[PDB]
């Protein structure tokens, strides 16, 4: 079912004033890869930072309110935001941070991009319990000529 993905600055900054603190298309490929094809489920935040659907995937908003854009699905809590993925052999949640926190408990599987920056945040990625997931795969990158910063890639899964 319900798996994580996110990148983490430092101390597990996520956000600052509504946008990702970096630039790292290599972190934005990564979460295509693996996230197409499968429903992905976002905060209203998010929606709003990123502005545009999301192709190749369902796309489920949750909101407290009315929808605002009906190329997407617009849910109310987090049961009906399961239930508009159906049957799929996994969800995908995609932030922001009110959202995992919500969703962490739910989850088998996370998706992290760990960046070797450190910059100001706002918005946090929850505290998680290392003791409880176990490192499945990891990858290493220098920065280049289109990353100005290095970051690893990891799945963790639920121990
Ligand atoms: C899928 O996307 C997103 C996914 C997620 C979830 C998510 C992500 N990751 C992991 N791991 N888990 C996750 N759950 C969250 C998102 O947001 C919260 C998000 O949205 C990011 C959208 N992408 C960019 O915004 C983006 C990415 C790369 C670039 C880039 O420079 O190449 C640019 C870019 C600029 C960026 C900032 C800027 N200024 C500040 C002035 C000016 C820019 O000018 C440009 C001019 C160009 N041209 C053609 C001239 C071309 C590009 C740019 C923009
Ligand atoms: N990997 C990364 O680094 C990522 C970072 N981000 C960043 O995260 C930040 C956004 O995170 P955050 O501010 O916590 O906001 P969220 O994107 O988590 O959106 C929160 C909003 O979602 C709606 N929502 C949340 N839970 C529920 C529920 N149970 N029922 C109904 N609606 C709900 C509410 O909308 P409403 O007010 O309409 O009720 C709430 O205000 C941004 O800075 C963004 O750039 C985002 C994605 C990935
Ligand atoms: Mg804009
Ligand atoms: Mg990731
Ligand atoms: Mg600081």
Same mark, same amino acid.
């Given at each position: 079912?319900?798996?994580?993905?996110?990148?983490?600055?430092?101390?597990?900054? @996520?956000? !600052?004033?509504?946008? !990702?603190?970096?630039?790292?298309?290599?972190?934005?490929?990564?979460?295509?890869?693996?996230?197409?094809?499968?429903?992905?489920?976002?905060?209203?935040?998010?929606?709003?930072?990123?502005?545009?659907?999301?192709?190749?995937?369902?796309?489920? @908003?949750?909101?407290?309110?009315?929808?605002?854009?009906?190329? %997407?699905?617009?849910?109310?809590?987090?049961?009906?935001?399961?239930?508009?993925?159906?049957? %799929?052999?996994?969800? !995908?949640?995609?932030?922001?941070?009110?959202?995992?926190? $919500?969703?962490?408990?739910?989850? $088998?599987?996370?998706?992290?991009?760990?960046?070797?920056?450190?910059?100001?945040?706002?918005?946090?990625?929850? /505290?998680?319990?290392?003791? /409880?997931?176990?490192?499945?795969?990891?990858?290493?990158?220098?920065?280049?000529? $289109?990353?100005?910063?290095?970051?690893?890639?990891?799945?963790?899964?639920?121990?």
């Amino acid at each position: 079912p319900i798996s994580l993905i996110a990148a983490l600055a430092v101390d597990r900054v @996520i956000g !600052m004033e509504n946008a !990702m603190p970096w630039n790292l298309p290599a972190d934005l490929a990564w979460f295509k890869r693996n996230t197409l094809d499968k429903p992905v489920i976002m905060g209203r935040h998010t929606w709003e930072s990123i502005g545009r659907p999301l192709p190749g995937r369902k796309n489920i @908003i949750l909101s407290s309110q009315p929808g605002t854009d009906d190329r %997407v699905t617009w849910v109310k809590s987090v049961d009906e935001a399961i239930a508009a993925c159906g049957d %799929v052999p996994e969800i !995908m949640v995609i932030g922001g941070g009110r959202v995992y926190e $919500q969703f962490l408990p739910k989850a $088998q599987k996370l998706y992290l991009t760990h960046i070797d920056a450190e910059v100001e945040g706002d918005t946090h990625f929850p /505290d998680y319990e290392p003791d /409880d997931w176990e490192s499945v795969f990891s990858e290493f990158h220098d920065a280049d000529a $289109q990353n100005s910063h290095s970051y690893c890639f990891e799945i963790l899964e639920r121990r």
